[model samples]
Target: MLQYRIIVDGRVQGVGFRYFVQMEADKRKLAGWVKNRDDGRVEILAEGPENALQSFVEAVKNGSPFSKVTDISVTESRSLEGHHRFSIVYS
Candidate 1:
C-alpha cells in the first residue's frame, strides 16, 4: 500500500491519541499503525488510497478529546508496499 508516516508532536503522549488514530484508520478502510515514541511524540503510519492518507494527515492532529495539537510532520517520501493488514503498533 502507498503510505504516509507522520510524527505528531506536542501533548500527544498519555492521552489515548494512538487509539483515536486506530479508530480513524478503520473508518476510512486504511491500513497501518500508531504508537508512542520514546521522546514523547506520537507516530502514525497509514496506507491506502492517497486521498485517505491525506485525510489522515489532518484527522490525527485532531487527536483525542483532551489532547492538544501543536504540530504535525508527514514523511511523504517513503517507499510503497502492498500492506495486507492493519493494527496498532506497540509502543
Candidate 2:
C-alpha cells in the first residue's frame, strides 16, 4: 500500500468536500481520513493501491458540487498508519 498526504485549497469548506472525498475513498477501498483545517484548506491522508490512489486524487480534484478547487498539493510515501477504512475526521 501507498500513502498520500493531500492538501486542497479554494472554496472547499462548508461545501461537503470532505464527505465527497470520503465517498470516493470508500469506493476505491482506501483507508485513511479527510478533514478540514483551520486555515480553510482540506487535508486528506489516504492509503491504498497505486492505481486507486491516483484515481482518488483525480476525484478529489473534481471536488464537490459547491466547491471550486483552485489548487491541490499531494505527497506520497510508504504506508505507515495501516488504517482499515476511510472516514471524515472532525475537530
Candidate 3:
C-alpha cells in the first residue's frame, strides 16, 4: 500500500476541499481522511494502492472547482491502521 500526508494550501478550507477529497477517494475506492488546520491548510492522510493514491493526489493538486490551490506538499508514509472508508474530520 501507498500513503501520503498532503498539505493543501491556499483557499483550501470552507470551499469543499475536504468534501471533494472524500468523494474523489471514495470513487477510486481509496481510504483516507481530510481535515482543516488552524493555518487554513487542509491536511490529508491517505493509504491505498500506489496507482489509486497517485491519482487521488493528482486530483487534489488540480483541485476542486471552488478551490484555488496555491501549493500542495506530498509526503510518503508507511500505511496506517483502521482506514476502511474516506472521511472528513474537524480539528
TM-score of each: 0.81, 0.89, 0.88
Model 1, backbone clash pairs (residues 3+ apart or across chains), number? 3
Clashing pairs in 1: 1-81, 1-82, 1-83
lDDT of 3 by residue, 1-91 (tens): 6788889887775657688888888989888888888887889888888888889888888865587578989898766656898888867
Task: Tell me the spans in candidate 3 whose CA falls farther than 4 Å from its real position.
Answer: none
Model 2, poorest ten-residue lDDT window? 60-69
For candidate 1, give the lDDT. 0.74
Q: Judged by TM-score, which candidate is best?
A: 2
lDDT of 1 by residue, 4-90 (tens): 888988777555777777777888888787778888788887668888888877776775456657888888744656565667767
Worst 10 residues of 3 by lDDT: 8-17
> Which portions of model 1 miss their true places by more than 4 Å?
none
lDDT winner among the candidates? Answer: 2
* Candidate 1 residue 58 C-alpha distance from true site, Å: 1.0
Residue 33's lDDT within candidate 3 is 86
